Amino acid sequence: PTVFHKRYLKKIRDLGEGHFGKVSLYCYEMVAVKALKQHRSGWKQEIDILRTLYHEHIIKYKGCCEDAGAASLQLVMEYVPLGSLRDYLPRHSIGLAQLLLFAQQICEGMAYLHSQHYIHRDLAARNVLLDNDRLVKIGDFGLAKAVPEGHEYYRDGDSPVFWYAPECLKEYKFYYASDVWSFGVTLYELLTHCDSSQSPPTKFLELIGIAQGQMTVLRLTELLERGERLPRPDKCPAEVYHLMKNCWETEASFRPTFENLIPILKTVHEKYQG
Numbered sequence: 001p002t003v004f005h006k007r008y009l010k011k012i013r014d015l016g017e018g019h020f021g022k023v024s025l026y027c028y029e030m031v032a033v034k035a036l037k038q039h040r041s042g043w044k045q046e047i048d049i050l051r052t053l054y055h056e057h058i059i060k061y062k063g064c065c066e067d068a069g070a071a072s073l074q075l076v077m078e079y080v081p082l083g084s085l086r087d088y089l090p091r092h093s094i095g096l097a098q099l100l101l102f103a104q105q106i107c108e109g110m111a112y113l114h115s116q117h118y119i120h121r122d123l124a125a126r127n128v129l130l131d132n133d134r135l136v137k138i139g140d141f142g143l144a145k146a147v148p149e150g151h152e153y154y155r156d157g158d159s160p161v162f163w164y165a166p167e168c169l170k171e172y173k174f175y176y177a178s179d180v181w182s183f184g185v186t187l188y189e190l191l192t193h194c195d196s197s198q199s200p201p202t203k204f205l206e207l208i209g210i211a212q213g214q215m216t217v218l219r220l221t222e223l224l225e226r227g228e229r230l231p232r233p234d235k236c237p238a239e240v241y242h243l244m245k246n247c248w249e250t251e252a253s254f255r256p257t258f259e260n261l262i263p264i265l266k267t268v269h270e271k272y273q274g
């Protein structure tokens with residue numbers, strides 16, 4: 001609800017861009033401001049969403065301002081200092097216990113998101129932000145959607161297909177279980193420390209090849225239904241990988257909820273946290 005006056009706004013630098021908008025670091029206190037580059041109508045929804053989302057593992061809304069240069073509003077948020085895990089992990093040697101802590105927190109955050117009856121549709125390492133080495137936050141909701149009252153699923157080249165479940169690439173339906181498939185891929189990223197050479201796009205394209213023209217997704221869909229999966233990350237515990245494969249069930253109903261995962265991650269964490 002707070003109003004930011006674009007007059008006390010000093011642009012420090014760019015923090016990122018993707019899908020619809022761009023995010024820049026601003027001085028006012030330091031804030032991260034997101035701006036919109038049909039897309040317009042969703043932007044009104046996204047903002048409202050973030051305004052009504054309050055959780056220790058979801059980026060904090062702080063207000064809006066007059067984006068004079070683009071017929072709408074900008075979305076002011078808190079500045080998460082250490083950036084996303086995709087940015088951070090490649091540069092910092094993090095232990096397994098810590099990574100599992102991040103994982104548990106992502107689930108806590110996702111569990112809360114779903115209980116608000118929202119799907120995310122873009123859960124990846126690039127969208128998880130590091131506040132400090134013991135705190136992580138979901139930092140973007142550009143694709144987030146409200147799940148229709150009387151349905152269990154919600155119905156683009158900018159889609160993160162390498163993070164998506166088969167029912168998304170195939171039936172174009174997005175279930176809460178779909179986000180869980182995404183979490184599994186996000187868990188994989190963490191365990192590989194977001195190394196570029198091991199990324200979902202890179203590894204999935206090694207399997208599919210690049211002489212597939214307009215059929216990248218169709219090939220992707222059918223290798224997933226042959227039961228093929230992302231490899232086990234080196235130094236990834238056996239049971240953890242099993243936890244990954246369980247999130248990657250072809251049958252979405254065989255997938256654990258984020259509810260179910262919190263208890264399990266909590267225990268696997270305490271284990272290796274010793």
Ligand SMILES: Cn1cc(Nc2nccc(N3C[C@H]4CC[C@@H](C3)N4C(=O)[C@@H]3CC3(F)F)n2)cn1
Binds near residue numbers: 016032080084139142
């Ligand atoms: C590089 N860096 C970033 C920080 N911290 C920080 N504090 C708040 C938001 C934020 N975001 C950037 C990224 C990650 C989530 C979303 C917001 N981002 C996007 O790129 C969205 C797609 C889009 F541009 F709209 N990043 C520090 N260094």
